[PDB]
């Protein structure tokens with residue numbers, strides 16, 4: 001049931017951010033993220 | 041940000057359908073695979089350079105339906121809904137201002153032969169085994185990534201770079217900017233209608249400048265021109281005798297028997313091999329200039345668009361407030377906004 | 381914060397143990413070095429139009445007057461093979477230098493410092509970074525603060541209390557919908573709006589979108605509490 | 621005194637200038653002294 005498919009690539013999740021002239025979002029919490037970068 | 045991809049097959053360039061020549065070209069061993077492999081390395085690096093400059097978000101942000109940005113007017117740099125390609129007004133100027141050679145979008149005889157075969161260089165390049173591959177991302181997908189970074193910038197400030205996009209009113213974002221350049225935020229709010237009129241008027245000068253002056257996109261046209269001039273020089277080298285009796289393998293094979301056709305053909309193989317290795321070395325060196333430009337453009341996307349920079353004269357001249365990315369043929373344009 | 385960091389390092393330990401597709405930038409360098417040498421060794425097989433690929437066969441079969449014509453083809457093709465390898469290596473080595481100068485810049489700015497540069501020292505806001513060695517390379521473990529659980533708030537550019545307009549000294553005004561506060565820009569810690577949290581400039585007619593709320597003066601309850609002391613003393617001292 | 625901070629005596633700083641520095645707590649305590657004296661003046665009468 002597997003096959004090679006072909007598709008137009010999705011650039012990312014589509015997202016309407018909720019702008020308004022008097023609305024702000026502020027984080028009540030955080031995550032410390034450790035991320036690995038690799039260089040020759 | 042990139043240059044035209046190219047694949048040149050060693051066989052149709054050197055030997056041009058002669059199987060007799062092909063049985064000599066194998067005697068030079070792995071040089072053809074090195075050329076094919078090289079150009080493939082350059083061609084993949086063009087998609088990587090474009091991906092690293094534009095794909096700096098995993099989410100495609102879009103602008104709200106109501107454009108209440110505190111009196112600032114982004115309508116000239118945001119996407120136009122009415123257009124079949126989702127370019128902004130300034131991007132559609134930039135897209136007209138660069139004259140291309142071969143987008144790769146299906147060349148199919150009826151365009152290639154007859155009347156157009158005289159004036160067109162691109163069909164003759166294809167006939168001689170030189171091919172231009174399309175970019176992985178269409179100019180529509182670059183326009184969508186540019187829209188996401190711009191819609192993120194005007195609705196969310198730098199926060200869409202550091203994590204999830206957080207809305208902030210645009211005059212409060214522009215106040216956080218002023219505070220960044222060491223100017224107290226009441227200097228924005230007490231002067232906001234003036235600051236918006238200065239910004240709106242300055243964006244108007246970009247419209248006029250790009251409509252008016254021929255020199256503006258010189259940094260992009262000199263990439264497209266070097267791509268086209270190197271391909272034309274490589275087509276022209278098929279004319280060269282290299283000390284053979286003719287420039288054309290079919291002439292030599294019409295006139296001569298194997299025993300000395302091999303000697304006349306060996307010369308043409310040699311010089312042709314040398315003409316490809318010259319072109320591929322020049323393209324490898326150029327590709328390193330374009331990757332150095334793309335890594336700078338990705339660094340400016342990260343630091344001037346997704347952020348605000350303390351680095352003097354990095355994000356345009358002045359004290360940096362913010363920047364808006366715009367797409368261009370094989371390139372990126374930053375509209376840097378600075379307090380002077 | 382320590383438990384988030386210890387768990388995040390634990391995920392690097394697992395990730396590097398688990399997935400083959402990680403050090404691809406380094407294995408690509410070793411593969412390009414190995415491929416280029418294999419291709420240069422394979423080019424010793426090529427005839428270049430001579431009667432043999434092997435120099436001793438030509439010197440076995442032929443006398444000097446024509447062995448030199450067969451040899452000159454092999455000298456030419458071999459010498460062209462070396463210049464091709466050496467040009468490819470000179471070009472590649474400039475890519476690895478550009479990578480090394482970026483890695484030296486990241487060692488200076490992310491390890492020996494903290495960077496205000498967005499996305500230069502990993503994704504997030506940069507806290508610190510730890511270097512680790514690798515075959516022919518460096519790995520940076522970038523540690524970043526990422527804001528996570530948000531709530532929406534109503535906001536205003538200024539507060540009006542006495543026809544005078546007030547702005548935060550640092551942070552932003554927010555309201556939960558009933559009352560107003562200042563918070564720091566990147567983390568919700570709301571505080572009562574006071575003359576310590578805010579500064580005054582001009583009057584409320586110029587600031588677009590200014591809102592009315594009281595601004596507390598924390599010196600006034602001191603002078604008030606001493607006015608009650610002053611009255612109880614004066615009231616008592618009606619009696620003597 | 622909210623626009624400025626204090627450190628050291630004036631003898632060390634090259635090019636220092638004389639001017640008054642306003643203390644915004646002082647007129648509060650001065651108005652509190654005028655309030656105190658009007659209360660004490662009235663208190664002469666009972």
Ligand SMILES: *[C@@H]1O[C@H](CO)[C@@H](O[C@@H]2O[C@H](CO)[C@@H](O[C@H]3O[C@H](CO)[C@@H](O)[C@H](O)[C@@H]3O)[C@H](O)[C@H]2NC(C)=O)[C@H](O)[C@H]1NC(C)=O
Nearest residue numbers: 027028029030031032381382383384385386387388528529
């Ligand atoms: C801020 O986000 C933190 C996660 O990034 C979150 O920590 C998580 O808190 C919950 C409880 O609210 C923990 O849940 C576990 O708690 C105990 C065991 O320790 C059990 O009784 C529960 O059934 C459950 O297993 C999470 O383990 C914990 N996660 C981490 C990584 O520590 C904070 O609660 C958030 N803080 C605020 C103020 O919102």
Ligand SMILES: *[C@@H]1O[C@H](CO)[C@@H](O[C@@H]2O[C@H](CO)[C@@H](O[C@H]3O[C@H](CO)[C@@H](O)[C@H](O)[C@@H]3O)[C@H](O)[C@H]2NC(C)=O)[C@H](O)[C@H]1NC(C)=O
Nearest residue numbers: 106107108109111112113114115116129240241243244247
């Ligand atoms: C943001 O700035 C825009 C550029 O100045 C502005 O759009 C421009 O608005 C004027 C006035 O409406 C238009 O003038 C023309 O109006 C109609 C258009 O059909 C014509 O009949 C008139 O003769 C006149 O020429 C401009 O053409 C228009 N420009 C564009 C590119 O649309 C926006 O209105 C501003 N946005 C806000 C929210 O104020």
Ligand SMILES: *[C@@H]1O[C@H](CO)[C@@H](O[C@@H]2O[C@H](CO)[C@@H](O[C@H]3O[C@H](CO)[C@@H](O)[C@H](O)[C@@H]3O)[C@H](O)[C@H]2NC(C)=O)[C@H](O)[C@H]1NC(C)=O
Nearest residue numbers: 531533534554555556557558559560561569570571572573
């Ligand atoms: C907006 O934030 C306000 C500050 O946190 C909050 O007001 C506070 O609400 C709590 C109850 O949820 C009150 O707590 C008191 O409740 C009674 C009052 O008589 C007492 O029995 C308790 O011991 C306790 O003291 C706080 O007093 C109150 N604070 C103030 C300054 O009024 C609002 O509820 C929040 N509004 C929303 C919509 O979230």
Ligand SMILES: *[C@@H]1O[C@H](CO)[C@@H](O[C@@H]2O[C@H](CO)[C@@H](O[C@H]3O[C@H](CO)[C@@H](O)[C@H](O)[C@@H]3O)[C@H](O)[C@H]2NC(C)=O)[C@H](O)[C@H]1NC(C)=O
Nearest residue numbers: 539540541542543544583584585588589590591592593594
């Ligand atoms: C924010 O709070 C302000 C102070 O309470 C308030 O200002 C007051 O607004 C009203 C209505 O504009 C004015 O009322 C007077 O209007 C005219 C004369 O100017 C007369 O016809 C009326 O009878 C009445 O006297 C007040 O004079 C004005 N006070 C001050 C000191 O400016 C704002 O309206 C409030 N705004 C919001 C959105 O809450």
Ligand SMILES: *[C@@H]1O[C@H](CO)[C@@H](O[C@@H]2O[C@H](CO)[C@@H](O[C@H]3O[C@H](CO)[C@@H](O)[C@H](O)[C@@H]3O)[C@H](O)[C@H]2NC(C)=O)[C@H](O)[C@H]1NC(C)=O
Nearest residue numbers: 627628629630631632633634635636637638639640641642
């Ligand atoms: C800045 O303000 C200072 C305070 O008013 C002022 O200091 C004063 O300077 C004069 C001259 O140096 C001194 O005058 C005395 O000088 C000697 C004794 O020291 C006597 O011969 C004089 O008759 C006289 O008594 C003041 O004593 C001195 N005051 C203090 C507190 O040190 C500076 O001179 C001013 N500078 C400028 C440029 O305005």
Ligand SMILES: *[C@@H]1O[C@H](CO[C@@H]2O[C@@H](C)[C@@H](O)[C@@H](O)[C@@H]2O)[C@@H](O[C@@H]2O[C@H](CO)[C@@H](O)[C@H](O)[C@H]2NC(C)=O)[C@H](O)[C@H]1NC(C)=O
Nearest residue numbers: 015016017018019020023024025026207529530531532533
């Ligand atoms: C932050 O606000 C946005 C949109 O504004 C809110 O809309 C109502 C739901 C109500 O809360 C109003 O007072 C606000 O003005 C929220 O976006 C909505 O998200 C839900 C999914 O959670 C989605 O179904 C809706 O279609 C979205 N609405 C719009 C206009 O986009 C968002 O959820 C709020 N964020 C948080 C953390 O509460």
Ligand SMILES: *[C@@H]1O[C@H](CO)[C@@H](O)[C@H](O)[C@H]1NC(C)=O
Nearest residue numbers: 020021022108110588589590
């Ligand atoms: C914000 O938008 C509303 C409409 O939703 C409008 O009535 C109001 O005047 C605007 N306020 C500011 C401060 O821009």
Ligand SMILES: *[C@@H]1O[C@H](CO)[C@@H](O)[C@H](O)[C@H]1NC(C)=O
Nearest residue numbers: 612613614615616617619620
């Ligand atoms: C009232 O004043 C007398 C001194 O005159 C003092 O002894 C007494 O403690 C005072 N009481 C109060 C409540 O002030």
Ligand SMILES: *[C@@H]1O[C@H](CO)[C@@H](O)[C@H](O)[C@H]1NC(C)=O
Nearest residue numbers: 631632633634635636637638
């Ligand atoms: C400044 O220059 C003047 C001469 O123009 C000199 O008298 C004075 O001492 C100098 N002041 C300082 C603080 O250097």
Ligand SMILES: *[C@@H]1O[C@H](CO)[C@@H](O)[C@H](O)[C@H]1NC(C)=O
Nearest residue numbers: 618658659661662663665666
């Ligand atoms: C003086 O004191 C009396 C109470 O003893 C008070 O009623 C009156 O208002 C005071 N007047 C002034 C001017 O303080």
